[PDB]
Enzyme design. Structure first.
Site, mmCIF file in Angstrom:
data_model
loop_
_atom_site.group_PDB
_atom_site.id
_atom_site.type_symbol
_atom_site.label_atom_id
_atom_site.label_comp_id
_atom_site.label_asym_id
_atom_site.label_seq_id
_atom_site.Cartn_x
_atom_site.Cartn_y
_atom_site.Cartn_z
ATOM 1 N N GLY C 17 -4.629 11.984 2.677
ATOM 2 C CA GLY C 17 -3.957 10.708 2.856
ATOM 3 C C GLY C 17 -2.593 10.639 2.202
ATOM 4 O O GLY C 17 -2.223 9.599 1.654
ATOM 5 N N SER C 19 0.674 10.853 3.398
ATOM 6 C CA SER C 19 1.920 10.565 4.100
ATOM 7 C C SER C 19 2.579 9.289 3.590
ATOM 8 O O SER C 19 3.800 9.128 3.754
ATOM 9 C CB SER C 19 1.678 10.524 5.618
ATOM 10 O OG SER C 19 0.987 9.365 6.007
ATOM 11 N N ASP C 67 -8.843 14.164 9.760
ATOM 12 C CA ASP C 67 -9.566 12.928 9.478
ATOM 13 C C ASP C 67 -10.489 13.247 8.303
ATOM 14 O O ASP C 67 -11.372 14.107 8.441
ATOM 15 C CB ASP C 67 -10.336 12.563 10.748
ATOM 16 C CG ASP C 67 -11.211 11.336 10.630
ATOM 17 O OD1 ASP C 67 -11.446 10.893 9.528
ATOM 18 O OD2 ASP C 67 -11.636 10.802 11.698
ATOM 19 N N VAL C 68 -10.261 12.612 7.133
ATOM 20 C CA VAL C 68 -11.080 12.926 5.943
ATOM 21 C C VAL C 68 -12.538 12.627 6.175
ATOM 22 O O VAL C 68 -13.377 13.151 5.451
ATOM 23 C CB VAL C 68 -10.681 12.161 4.642
ATOM 24 C CG1 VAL C 68 -9.371 12.641 4.104
ATOM 25 C CG2 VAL C 68 -10.688 10.606 4.862
ATOM 26 N N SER C 146 -9.659 2.949 -8.166
ATOM 27 C CA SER C 146 -8.989 1.633 -8.220
ATOM 28 C C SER C 146 -9.592 0.880 -9.384
ATOM 29 O O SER C 146 -10.751 1.127 -9.727
ATOM 30 C CB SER C 146 -9.203 0.824 -6.919
ATOM 31 O OG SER C 146 -8.565 -0.461 -6.993
ATOM 32 N N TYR C 160 -14.521 -2.469 -0.270
ATOM 33 C CA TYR C 160 -13.496 -1.642 -0.912
ATOM 34 C C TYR C 160 -13.885 -1.304 -2.352
ATOM 35 O O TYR C 160 -13.925 -0.124 -2.744
ATOM 36 C CB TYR C 160 -12.149 -2.369 -0.858
ATOM 37 C CG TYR C 160 -11.018 -1.594 -1.508
ATOM 38 C CD1 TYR C 160 -10.510 -0.453 -0.933
ATOM 39 C CD2 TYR C 160 -10.418 -2.066 -2.701
ATOM 40 C CE1 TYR C 160 -9.457 0.239 -1.554
ATOM 41 C CE2 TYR C 160 -9.379 -1.399 -3.308
ATOM 42 C CZ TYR C 160 -8.908 -0.254 -2.728
ATOM 43 O OH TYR C 160 -7.847 0.389 -3.319
ATOM 44 N N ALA C 162 -16.848 -1.493 -3.681
ATOM 45 C CA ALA C 162 -18.017 -0.603 -3.659
ATOM 46 C C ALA C 162 -17.603 0.862 -3.488
ATOM 47 O O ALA C 162 -18.189 1.771 -4.112
ATOM 48 C CB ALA C 162 -18.957 -0.997 -2.521
ATOM 49 N N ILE C 193 0.215 -1.372 -7.521
ATOM 50 C CA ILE C 193 1.297 -0.410 -7.431
ATOM 51 C C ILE C 193 2.180 -0.809 -6.273
ATOM 52 O O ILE C 193 1.661 -1.178 -5.212
ATOM 53 C CB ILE C 193 0.728 1.003 -7.197
ATOM 54 C CG1 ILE C 193 -0.321 1.343 -8.252
ATOM 55 C CG2 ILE C 193 1.878 1.997 -7.097
ATOM 56 C CD1 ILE C 193 0.270 1.363 -9.676
#
Ligand code: CL
Ligand code: CL
Ligand code: CL
Ligand code: CL
Lengths: 262, 259, 262, 259
Positions: C17, C19, C67-68, C146, C160, C162, C193
């Site tokens: 991720g 880019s 795609d991760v 996070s 998110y 979780a 950020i």
């Protein structure tokens, strides 16, 4: 019949610093459950007033005048409690002061006054009570800590927060030393709780405090008393060295903007 | 001591065995009517029959927590049997072991699905009924593994148990206007039927690494859940309580040995 | 001469991720230290733009479209990185999405999309990279988590949060399994950020965000890149299974009132 | 990799031995001039002579961290030698052992005084100079013991190490307008001169209970402190970093043994 927890009626407790605020609420909650309670404090007038106010409770609330920062008073308190009640099952190491001072203004005496009441007074009452709590076979120590220190910062309270985190560092080791004695030791971490003292500010500011909390209100001293009551139960015998935050969600939002996006 | 919960209505997911059955029995002894869920009708039937003598009525709903439709069905059937819904114990949990190299997508989804998604779906399906109760309570069965500790073979299990807590730290805020609290019990090592098949040497080794010197009981978890469910815990939300006999405290066996 | 940390020049990294946002900052920070970096993403146009933007860096930034959430793409990414660089030393498991949805609105697909990118994509790239990271003898995995989830709540982000806490539960066990391989695995927990995305709101709201943070500003993507760079150093070989919150003090105040009393 | 710290000015309290001497050497190797403090002039002199070949200049100030006047004197002498003050490593720490029953008021105050009050006083005395530097950095040497773990005999030690962190969570907020950050390193078990006198069996037992399979080095702590001190860590404050090889992760030796 219906059974929730095992009744604590007839057990014996000490609540240090019990004449006002959270400590009074802890004392009244235990007394309503039939536990006899000795509250301590330095001010006999305040102790007598609280003993009078609580005279109708099931368990009997009486007072000992004592300074938690003096180990000799801590020992006198335990002895007097055992004399009045017949033994000692529960110690609520509650006494706490919270003067404010910015870091550049705090003196050695300011720092020692706060660490001495809040931290040393917790250690000393636990030390004095160990032999009797061991003899009870189900000893319980509940520490009144705070979100401030373990979790949050608040300008002017760096010594206060230090003292409240010190209590927890202490009890994470104390729980191990006390496990062979069958004594558990845990802490309640109150958030913002309405007390007599906070009544001395306006509804405006209290409403701002509530609006920053997910529950939408300040807590009550009964909220802390009830958490301490749970730790004191036989049913909490496998909980030790641990913390329970009682704060209506105060520590959860990253800022007021997260509250507001609700 | 606390306000009686007699007559209230609870769901305990994964209630037929282990910690869930202890939670169910503890609430039923308090006079709370309890619907337990599970996938195995025989295990459910057995536990319903075992607990036939409790004050609160324990009954079963066969349901897969990973399926939101089963979650909605569980809530509807509970509201029908009891008249409403006061308490959800989001308990269902599996703990298969696999080293990181060996875990397939299916392994990870099975554990995340039961342990995390099944907690989310039962809370979602219960929101309306819990709101109507005016004192709604969610108690999540998490674990020390994930939030606090690491245990080789349980990296997906630990992820799912920590996921539950990340979820409820936000859910607590969303639920507070509805007067629903949400909290988690984090069990340490609890004596269950499954652990009783390990042999005494194994159980003795486990107990000797815990300051309390024993494994906990399923009632230890049940009684912590019962506290969160009281009206007296209305100011507790988004929080955790570790029930582990001190297990997480020592840095190593050397610390325990110094006792 | 003067020595701070041992130079990472010539080592090989993947930033999933990478880019845009924090991942781009991580990639640029490693490339400025002489580390060759493969960034991944689903959008070739975005990858190409970032590769062009970063063309002057010391280490070489190139891209793999992947795609991760697909383990086969995670394996292809590791193989392509080893082919381009000669080996693999560092994996920054960064990819993260953060759509919002209140609890009653989240579908199974919403929940799986967020848990799949944020959590499963972290697991899958670590799994694909293990053999090469072991062979390096100094493997490093840095996870972008996070404050939201591990520490805070934020309405609309319960899936998110979780997913970000799931990453940490995973790595507390992964660190034990990876220690015999001499791979460490740690997480940076960013606060708020400033990214390209947040530029799409007004100065008014960004100022409100900064005023709620003790540092008095939003963080930069370099703040996250530099924390990840520290974990990647040989000098951090004894740090594993751990977290570093990079948030200018955002998680410290109990509310805006504590900030305001400053 | 990070902006050079060459030419900046640091204090390391308790710098003559153990972790403090590792912190001092790590900063001096980065070209930072370092004043170490201690009560034993001979140990200070020895360490100054040992480190005479570092890029940054290491010198000593004899000082008791429990005395605020010595703290103010340490800062004044450092500003005089170096020209200013950029970095304070509040490191001094003692760790005598005593069971809870055996701890006297004097025992508790000695440990709280060195480990907690000595951290507060050096930060207080350095506030003005750190503010003038425009990039002030405080790094606190805490411990996993207290904040995270329990260890019989160290209840006062653990209290003092947790006290440091409660202090800096507020101090971080008070210091942020001055552009000073404050953070803590929480060491696990670090090989020091003192631990080297224990015998290999003892050290082997300790190392085998740690996932990394070894004790850490004093440079491990020094390099974490060096990161916090960089300009690149300006957005890190009020925070902790555990440097312990995984020590706090396993629930028990059984988890380590499953590897
Ligand atoms: Cl703490
Ligand atoms: Cl968590
Ligand atoms: Cl977590
Ligand atoms: Cl702490």
């Amino acid at each position: 019949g219906s059974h929730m927890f095992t009744s604590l009626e007839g057990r014996s407790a000490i609540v240090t610093g019990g004449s006002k605020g959270i400590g009074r609420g802890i004392a009244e909650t235990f007394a309503n459950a039939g536990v006899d309670v000795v509250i301590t404090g330095r001010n006999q007038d305040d102790l007598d007033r609280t003993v009078a106010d609580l005279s109708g409770t099931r368990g009997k609330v009486t007072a000992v005048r004592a300074d938690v920062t003096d180990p000799e008073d801590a020992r006198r308190t335990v002895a007097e409690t055992v004399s009045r009640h017949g033994g000692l099952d529960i110690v609520c190491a509650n006494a706490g002061i919270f003067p404010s001072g910015r870091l550049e203004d705090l003196t050695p005496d300011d720092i020692e006054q706060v660490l001495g009441v809040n931290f040393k007074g917790t250690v000393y009452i636990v030390q004095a009570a160990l032999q009797a709590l061991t003899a009870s076979g189900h000893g319980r120590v509940v520490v009144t800590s705070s979100i401030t220190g373990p979790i949050t910062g608040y300008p002017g309270w760096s010594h206060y927060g230090a003292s409240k985190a010190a209590q927890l560092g202490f009890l994470r080791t104390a729980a191990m030393e006390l496990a062979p004695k069958k004594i558990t030791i845990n802490a309640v971490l109150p958030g913002n709780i309405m007390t007599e003292g906070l009544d001395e500010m306006g509804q405006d500011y209290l409403d701002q405090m509530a609006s920053a909390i997910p529950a939408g209100r300040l807590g009550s001293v009964a909220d802390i008393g009830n958490a301490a009551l749970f730790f004191a139960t036989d049913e909490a015998a496998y909980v030790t060295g641990q913390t329970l935050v009682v704060d209506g969600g105060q520590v959860l939002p990253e800022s007021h903007l997260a509250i507001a996006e609700l």
